[PDB]
Structure formats: structure tokens, C-alpha cells
Amino acid sequence: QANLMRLKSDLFNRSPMYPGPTKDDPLTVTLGFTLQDIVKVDSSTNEVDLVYYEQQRWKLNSLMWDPNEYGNITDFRTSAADIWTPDITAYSSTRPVQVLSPQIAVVTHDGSVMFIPAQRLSFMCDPTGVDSEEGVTCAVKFGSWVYSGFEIDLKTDTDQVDLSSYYASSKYEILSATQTRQVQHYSCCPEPYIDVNLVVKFRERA
Template sequence: MDSSHGSSMNHGYQLLLRLLFLLLVGTGMTWCDDHEIRLMKHLMLDYDASVRPAAHHSQALSVNFSLSLHHIIDVDEKNQILTTSCWLTQIWMDNHLTWNETDFGGVTVIRLPYFKVWRPDIILYNNADSQYQSSVINTNVIVANNGEVTWLSHGIYKSSCDINVEYFPFDIQNCTLKWASWTYDGYQLDLVITTEEGDISNYHANGEFDLIGLSAFRHVQIYSCCPE
């Protein structure tokens, strides 16, 4: 491939992104007081963050997974890598994190350190970054008294993409970011999308690329080694 078609090129071209999930939830701040301290101790008593919080061990736990695209940082034609800045939102129910608000001064929402609760191990399967973990910023989880857990995270993601510059500078690239659980199968963790349109409400345009589409879809993969 001609190096003149590298990521530093000045010519603009169109880029089509296909993503698997979408939607971002905004939150505010909550004042920490004695009620929240008591509540945190209550929730963490005998809590095991390694146990999947399904209603029954034979039932799948539904996780709403969504993505908000903020910026296309780079399209590296030579190395076939797309670099994006994204917010991820994951929402699920944890029956072990419920409480009666009247017992805790009317507190209905609490923030907890993300590492203290169970979290789905959803990763970017076509990751192309050796420093994947260090490029992701994890925030506190937001827990409602009905057990709904919301986990927001931000990351700079490098994903592999088959880039074809045959028609440069009028080429259209189609890149897919593939997200899935690393250890849970579909009978244990059910990934849910709420819409087929990607969230670009906070997208900042890149002068080199025109974003012409962002979609989300679900694909079920069955491996011959593992029928589940």
C-alpha cells in the first residue's frame, strides 16, 4: 500500500461505521452523608462481586449495552486500524443491591466504586491496541434502590478494520466495532440493544473524514467447540 495514503493525508473521504450498541445516560452528583455511609456498608455486607447477579443461576442476565461516538481520531490505512473516542453505557439489574429508601433517609441512588460490584466482562473483540486496559477510563457505578446498575466508561479504542483505498480519495470505508462478553455465553449474559441507530449527538467532526452513517446490530455467533 502506498505510504502516501497514510493516516496523515490531507484528502477527505467518507467513512461508514457499523457498531453493535448505543445510547448514553447522563447523571448528576449526590451528596454523601451518614445515610449513604450506612447504605454502602449495608450493600457491601456479604456481597460477592465475582458472582453474576442473575435472579436464578439458570437464567441469563440482561445487559443493555450502548455506545456514544464522540470523535474519529484516526484511520490508519497502512496498519488497518480505526481509532475512536467513545462513551460506553452498560445497565443491568443486581438483586443483591436493593434497599428500602425509607430505611436510609430517603436515599434512592448511590455511587459505588466500579470494582466493588459485579460487572459484565464486555470487551472489544477486534481490539488492535496492546495497551487496551490503560486506554479505558472506568467511573463509579450508579446504583438505584430497585437494583438497577448503570456503568459509564470512556475509552480511546483502536479496532482492526479492512480498509480499501482502491478508489482513493473518493473511497467509502465500512468499519465494525465488535463487542461481546469474554467469558459468559448467551445463556448467562444477554446483550440487549435498544435501537438500530447509533448515538452521534455529541460527535465532533474530523476534517479528514465525513461520517455518513452509524448503526448498531446484534449478531449471535455459535462456535463448533462450544455449543452454548
């Protein structure tokens, strides 16, 4: 339909691509996790596999429009190929992340974007003692691979992972799941890098 075709043409065809954030124009990405399943533990390799979806939110002045000019359209669905998306990376993955959901984001007229990729992740986690009453704690950091806190900052709306869609017949019960903003430094670079640390305490369903 005609107004949406005109809006996407104006935002995407009639302009150069956003080159990502800079020290002079930084952005904040909001992250939140919905943990669906601890699928698998490998005690020979200390790898654990999670299925989750990761809510990402950011805002660009370059994606703003006036709904009055575009038939009162206030938001639209678009291919994530059409827009810049942040390079949010699991810092202790052992396999490439597997994508479980369509690469489609929602853009709102204030320039705000929400993108909610479902992923299967293999990460470094020692499951020794998962068969006990006290279980095991594992953690994985999610943040930009290449932008410091001077270009990409992160936040969470809450410290509590959403467990409302956790698989009730998983082999693993969740005892706690937190998502916490964290600062790290790396050998290569003096600047602080920001991540959200996902910390999960679990045990066999003891």
C-alpha cells in the same frame, strides 16, 4: 453523609461478592455507544482508532434496598471496584483499550446499575477508499468474552449510535453508525454468544 455510608456498608461490607451470572440466574446487559471521534486510520496495518463512551445497564436483586430505610436515597455513585461489572470486550481490538473516564457507576434502589466508560479502541479496519465519496465500512463486535447467551444476554434500546457529540472537526465524517444485537458461535463451545455489532461507514471530511 450518614445514610449513604450506612447503605454502602450494608450492601458491600455485610455480604459476600456477587459471583456473576449463571444459567439458573442469567442477566441482560443493555449497551449503547456515543461515538465522539474517529481519531486515526493506519493504512499500513489496517487499524482504526475510535473514541466513544459505552453505556452499560444491568440489574441485580442483591443491589436492591428500600429508600425509606436509608433517608429516601434512591441512587448512589460508587467505585466500579465495589460491584460486579460485565466483561464486555471488543472482539477485534489490536491494542488494550485505553480508559478515558473515572471507574464510577450509579446504583439505583431497584438494583439497576449504569456504568458509562469512555474508551479509545484500536481495531481491525481496512481504511482503503476513505478518501472517496462512498467511504469505507468497518465493524467491531462488543460482548462477553467468557459468558454465553445462557448467562449474559444483550440488547440495545435503539439500532442508531448516538452521534450528537461526534467531533465536528474530525478528519472523518460519519455517513452511518448502527449498533445491532448479534449471535455468534465459536470453535471451543456449542452455545451461542451474544454481541452488539458496531457498524460505522465514514469518509474523509471527498
